Amino acid sequence: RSRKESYSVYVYKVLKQVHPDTGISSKAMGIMNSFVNDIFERIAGEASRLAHYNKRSTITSREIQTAVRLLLPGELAKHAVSEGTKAVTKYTSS
Amino acid sequence: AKSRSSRAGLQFPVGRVHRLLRKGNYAERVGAGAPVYLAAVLEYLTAEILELAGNAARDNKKTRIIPRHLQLAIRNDEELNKLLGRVTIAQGGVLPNIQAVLLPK
Amino acid sequence: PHRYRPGTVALREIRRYQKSTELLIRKLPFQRLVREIAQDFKTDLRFQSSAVMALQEACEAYLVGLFEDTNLCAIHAKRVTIMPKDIQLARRIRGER
Amino acid sequence: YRPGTVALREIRRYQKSTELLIRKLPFQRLVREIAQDFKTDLRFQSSAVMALQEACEAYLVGLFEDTNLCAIHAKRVTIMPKDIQLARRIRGERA
Amino acid sequence: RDNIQGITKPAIRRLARRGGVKRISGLIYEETRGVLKVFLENVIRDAVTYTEHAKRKTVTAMDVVYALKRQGRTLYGFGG
Amino acid sequence: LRDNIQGITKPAIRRLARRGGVKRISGLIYEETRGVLKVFLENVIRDAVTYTEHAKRKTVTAMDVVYALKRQGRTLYGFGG
Amino acid sequence: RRKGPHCERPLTQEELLREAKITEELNLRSLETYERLEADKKKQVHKKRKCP
DNA sequence: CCCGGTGCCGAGGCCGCTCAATTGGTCGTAGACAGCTCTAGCACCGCTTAAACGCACGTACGCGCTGTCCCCCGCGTTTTAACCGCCAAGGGGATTACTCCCTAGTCTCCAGGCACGTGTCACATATATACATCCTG
DNA sequence: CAGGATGTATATATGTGACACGTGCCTGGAGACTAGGGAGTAATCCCCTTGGCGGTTAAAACGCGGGGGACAGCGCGTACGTGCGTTTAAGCGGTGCTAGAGCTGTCTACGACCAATTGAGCGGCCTCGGCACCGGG
């Protein structure tokens, strides 16, 4: 067989973190994986476009931040930016 | 020894995200913090949607997120709706809503 | 005998099918139509069982949205009933025409 | 003149030219107003402002072209607010 | 062949119910059939264009998803 | 600035409607058009300022507006060099 | 935590039930004999004429 | 629509292997930052005046009502096929062998992209009668 | 069934904006010429997932009847258009000033890159329990 791959494990872990007792079916898990892949594709494309605009040959955390700003509507953008910045700050300290 | 996900405090695979970014032709140089940031944003969105769908399925006496309630959450949340506007969730159905003009009385 | 007034069973059907999540188009006729359409694009092409289901899902979602916009356009004209002109206006505003 | 003749004349006149229909000096001030809510002391290029005005005019022309059909759908000649509202709703801006 | 009539009046009526309509005209079915036929034709054309380049004898749900994404009707549930 | 949305007057909106084909216009159509134009400019200029701030620039260039319009779906030619 | 189920009518009497079914035997035999006789006396398999 | 019983297959947890993520180590290059500048964005003020604002008047369009005629809607019975299981075999995918195509590097060289000045070369603005093209009689 | 009375073309003209055309620069490109890499084409071949047989009831379909909804006619009212007069700030282009986008020059930390090691993830398998199904209230 091949090795199709998905974020199922991490989706299940986040599902347990948010609702410790509420499970999820296989169809729902696949839909969530597809959503994650589509959001990844969109954010990465926007970051690459920002890099090409700024003539930067690299996609940095700032590019990802601006791509998230250019896509998420308002409060969602403000929360995702805070999450990303906190994650990067905690990563830089280890 | 230590996965970058646990290092940054995230559950998503920072390493897999970095690999996909550097292999997806997005750029010639992936920053050290770019994949961490992207994984953090993805985890935030996933947690939002999972929590909403969980408490939408548990609102119907169930204990397992299904596509119907996933769609219900995505279409009831004004932010997630603008995000996934032109997206269609398979087996998600539609929101219960009958126009007042069609309604009797 | 006993029969409901016009407008009582339509609302029941709406309230039922708006909560039920299942393909409304008939599976085998839709598959035959997909095969017919693909025949005019390439001869002797096979289709995976899941491809036809995905096509049916997408077409049903598109038609549901189209009928929503059609009902909106019909109510805009003070008409509780929809008609092909409503679909025409819906598509015109959507930009499909 | 009969109500409507001088209006069809203006229709045929403005569907023939291509100049900007919104006044520059008033539209640039609106652009700077909307930019103030995002960044203080923000500079704008003349080309950028002209592109913004062109985009706005094209969007409004399309919106009024859809509103005309929305009004005609109700056997009405005058466009009412519900017409633009239906246009926006079916476009997906305020659904 | 001409099996476009497989999308029958009751199916179109149930689709209308799901879309929230409570009353259909007599000439709506022949218009919905043509609209659905055009939408299909387009999506299937894109899918077959993907399959030809893929060199696969079987059209795949992945090709269908790619066609839907090209047409702007992104669909979740079939691996994309 | 303030209340510059009123810089889009009734003659300007009526010319914009004439160019769109409308023959007769109502009274509240002008307010509706002002509100819609303001909502559109809000998003366009938000995208433009997002493209600008990220570039550490103090001037909103025309390419920023072009990219904002592309994001919003309104691809605009004539200002891309 | 507002509503709740209910149930009642827990009654089944062995001997009285035996009597009740021994009585229902009468109705069963009546139905069988009635069906048999009615069929035999009414059907008498045959056909009818046309209505032109 | 809600409630108690049964039931089953799909959800979720365990096993095990491997391949991607990680750790360690190097080069270099795009970038961060400071230095300089010169364009363009900003501010201002006056002469000109075209467009905007306010108001009057009535005419035609919204809109409300009524009436007919029918074209869908609900219900009953009648006819078609969608749907749920078996059985070949036709393809979608693993496995191995091998070559045309592209990568990388380094000179050699045709080509286009402006700085500048010069010479043509549109059609915007202006002017007028000719033509509709009305609308009140 | 006209005619003032407007408005809308149609044609002509000219001179100032702008295409249009040399004149040499050169530096970023464009291609030619060796050497090295590499991934996908091609041929088998094992293995699931299609496409093809016969029944079962469930949904599609045909009809009927009357009922409520579409569409047309008509009229009341008012507001939206057009014209006139008053008012205002919009367009112009003339001058002054400096702010920072941009070019540039230098020094440097970060990431691609390469090799070895390790465990996170994923196919697979099995046991089990959340919800599908159902018949009475």
Curated annotation (Swiss-Prot), chain A:
Annotated positions of the Omega-N-methylarginine modification: R56, R62
GO cellular component: cytosol; extracellular exosome; extracellular space; nucleoplasm; nucleosome; nucleus
Modification N6-lactoyllysine occurs at: K13, K55, K78, K86, K90
Residues with the Phosphothreonine modification: T85
Location within or outside the cell: Nucleus; Chromosome
Modified residues (N6-(2-hydroxyisobutyryl)lysine): K4, K13, K16, K27, K55, K78, K86, K90
Sites of N6-malonyllysine modification: K86
Glycosylated residue positions: S82
Sequence positions bearing Phosphoserine: S6
GO BP terms, alphabetized: antibacterial humoral response; antimicrobial humoral immune response mediated by antimicrobial peptide; defense response to Gram-positive bacterium; innate immune response in mucosa; nucleosome assembly
MF terms (GO), sorted A to Z: DNA binding; identical protein binding; protein heterodimerization activity; structural constituent of chromatin
Dimethylated arginine: modified positions: R49
Residues annotated with N6-(beta-hydroxybutyryl)lysine modification: K4, K55, K86, K90
Modified residues (N6-succinyllysine): K4, K86, K90
Modified residues (N6-methylated lysine): K86
Entry-annotated residues carrying N6,N6,N6-trimethyllysine: K55
Residues bearing PTM N6-methyllysine: K16, K78
Protein's job: Core component of nucleosome. Nucleosomes wrap and compact DNA into chromatin, limiting DNA accessibility to the cellular machineries which require DNA as a template. Histones thereby play a central role in transcription regulation, DNA repair, DNA replication and chromosomal stability. DNA accessibility is regulated via a complex set of post-translational modifications of histones, also called histone code, and nucleosome remodeling.
Similarity comment: Belongs to the histone H2B family.
Protein name, per record: Histone H2B type 1-C/E/F/G/I
Residues shown, of full length: 32 to 125 of 126
Curated annotation (Swiss-Prot), chain D:
Summary of the function given for this chain in its UniProt record: Core component of nucleosome. Nucleosomes wrap and compact DNA into chromatin, limiting DNA accessibility to the cellular machineries which require DNA as a template. Histones thereby play a central role in transcription regulation, DNA repair, DNA replication and chromosomal stability. DNA accessibility is regulated via a complex set of post-translational modifications of histones, also called histone code, and nucleosome remodeling.
In-chain residues carrying the UniProt-annotated modification N6-methyllysine: K16, K24, K39, K82
Modified sites of kind Phosphotyrosine: Y1
GO cellular component labels: extracellular exosome; extracellular region; membrane; nucleoplasm; nucleosome; nucleus; protein-containing complex
Major localisation: nucleus
Natural source organism: Homo sapiens
UniProt PTM: Acetylation is generally linked to gene activation. Acetylation at Lys-82 (H3K122ac) by EP300/p300 plays a central role in chromatin structure: localizes at the surface of the histone octamer and stimulates transcription, possibly by promoting nucleosome instability.
Residue(s) carrying Phosphoserine: S17, S46
Subunit note: The nucleosome is a histone octamer containing two molecules each of H2A, H2B, H3 and H4 assembled in one H3-H4 heterotetramer and two H2A-H2B heterodimers. The octamer wraps approximately 147 bp of DNA. Interacts with TONSL; CHAF1A; CHAF1B; MCM2 and DNAJC9. Interacts with NASP; NASP is a histone chaperone that stabilizes and maintains a soluble pool of Histone H3-H4 dimers.
Protein's UniProt keywords contain Cell membrane: no
Recorded name of the encoding gene: H3C1
From Swiss-Prot, chain F:
Modified residues (N6-lactoyllysine): K10, K56, K70
Residues with the Phosphotyrosine modification: Y30, Y67
Any GO CC annotation of this UniProt entry: extracellular exosome
Effect of K70E: In TEBIVANED2; results in severe early developmental defects when expressed in zebrafish embryos
N6-acetyllysine carried by residues: K10, K70
Modified residue annotations for N6-(2-hydroxyisobutyryl)lysine: K10, K23, K38, K56, K58, K70
Glycyl lysine isopeptide (Lys-Gly) (interchain with G-Cter in SUMO2) crosslink residues: K10, K38, K58, K70
Cross-link entry Glycyl lysine isopeptide (Lys-Gly) (interchain with G-Cter in UFM1), positions: K10
Modified residues (N6-succinyllysine): K10, K56, K58, K70
GO MF annotation terms: DNA binding; protein heterodimerization activity; RNA binding; structural constituent of chromatin
Listed result of changing H54R: In TEBIVANED4; results in severe early developmental defects when expressed in zebrafish embryos
Residues bearing PTM N6-glutaryllysine: K10, K38, K56, K58, K70
Tagged with keyword tRNA-binding: no
Entry comment on modification after translation: Acetylated as part of spermatogenesis progression prior to histone-to-protamine exchange. Demethylation is performed by JMJD6.
Residue numbers bearing the N6-propionyllysine modification: K10, K23, K56, K58, K70
Compartments, record wording: Nucleus; Chromosome
GO biological process, one term: telomere organization
Binding partners and assembly: The nucleosome is a histone octamer containing two molecules each of H2A, H2B, H3 and H4 assembled in one H3-H4 heterotetramer and two H2A-H2B heterodimers. The octamer wraps approximately 147 bp of DNA. Found in a co-chaperone complex with DNJC9, MCM2 and histone H3.3-H4 dimers. Within the complex, interacts with DNJC9 (via C-terminus); the interaction is direct. Interacts with NASP; NASP is a histone chaperone that stabilizes and maintains a soluble pool of Histone H3-H4 dimers.
Entry similarity comment: Belongs to the histone H4 family.
The protein, known as: Histone H4
Organism: Homo sapiens
Gene: H4C1
Location of this fragment in the whole protein: 23 to 103 of 103
Curated annotation (Swiss-Prot), chain G:
Entry comment on modification after translation: Phosphorylation is enhanced by ZNHIT1 and promotes the interaction of VPS72 with histone H2AZ1.
Localization of this protein: Nucleus
Residues annotated to bind DNA: 1-50
Annotated coiled-coil segments of the chain: none
Main function: Deposition-and-exchange histone chaperone specific for H2AZ1, specifically chaperones H2AZ1 and deposits it into nucleosomes. As component of the SRCAP complex, mediates the ATP-dependent exchange of histone H2AZ1/H2B dimers for nucleosomal H2A/H2B, leading to transcriptional regulation of selected genes by chromatin remodeling.
Family recorded in the similarity comment: Belongs to the VPS72/YL1 family.
Subunit: Component of the NuA4 histone acetyltransferase complex which contains the catalytic subunit KAT5/TIP60 and the subunits EP400, TRRAP/PAF400, BRD8/SMAP, EPC1, DMAP1/DNMAP1, RUVBL1/TIP49, RUVBL2, ING3, actin, ACTL6A/BAF53A, MORF4L1/MRG15, MORF4L2/MRGX, MRGBP, YEATS4/GAS41 and VPS72/YL1. Component of a NuA4-related complex which contains EP400, TRRAP/PAF400, SRCAP, BRD8/SMAP, EPC1, DMAP1/DNMAP1, RUVBL1/TIP49, RUVBL2, actin, ACTL6A/BAF53A, VPS72 and YEATS4/GAS41. Also part of a multiprotein complex which contains SRCAP and which binds to H2AZ1/H2AZ.
Name of the protein: Vacuolar protein sorting-associated protein 72 homolog
Organism taxonomic ancestry: Eukaryota, Metazoa, Chordata, Craniata, Vertebrata
Gene that specifies this protein: VPS72
Residues of the full protein shown: 157 to 208 of 364
